[PDB]
């Protein structure tokens, strides 16, 4: 596990427009296109993205293109962010995994307002830092995905993961 195989569970893999678990335009793994509801919008975010005219599909590859790109871009978010960058260097590798996983969900300002989240993890207070991230309207929209993320917070470990 790493966390290329572990955003790939939590946001699967489809090549054809869709609406996220928000309403929302996306493609790929996870890849948000646009909150507009204009579908062509999307559409013209796609061919920007993907720099062709796609009509909506993309191939793996072209799907694997943008996912490396999106999660280069959520550490990114964490390393210039001055609340996010010195709980992630905190933390140990799968931890790190976790943090990342939340800012490519939600995006580096809806984590880093995480701030009770944050000092706990920060802390090393693993179980209270587990209870305070569920205590959030992402924990109650999408409970599973939570829930592993907090279990990986929890642990260390891989074990929410493993068998999937
Ligand atoms: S939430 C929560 N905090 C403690 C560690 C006290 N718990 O046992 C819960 C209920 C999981
Ligand atoms: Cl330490
Ligand atoms: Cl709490
Ligand atoms: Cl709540
Ligand atoms: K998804």
Request: glycine content about 6%.
């Amino acid at each position: 596990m790493n966390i290329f195989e572990m955003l790939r569970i939590d946001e699967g893999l489809r090549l054809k427009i869709y609406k996220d678990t928000e309403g929302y335009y996306t493609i790929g793994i996870g890849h948000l296109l646009t909150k507009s509801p204009s579908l062509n919008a999307a559409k013209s975010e796609l061919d920007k993205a993907i720099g062709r005219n796609t009509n909506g599909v993309i191939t793996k590859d072209e799907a694997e293109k943008l996912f490396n790109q999106d999660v280069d871009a959520a550490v990114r978010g964490i390393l210039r962010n001055a609340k996010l960058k010195p709980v992630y260097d905190s933390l140990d590798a799968v931890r790190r995994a976790a943090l990342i996983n939340m800012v490519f969900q939600m995006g580096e300002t809806g984590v880093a307002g995480f701030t009770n989240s944050l000092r706990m993890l920060q802390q090393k207070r693993w179980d209270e830092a587990a209870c305070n991230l569920a205590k959030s309207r992402w924990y109650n929209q999408t409970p599973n995905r939570a829930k592993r993320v907090i279990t990986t917070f929890r642990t260390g470990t891989w074990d929410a993961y493993k068998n999937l």
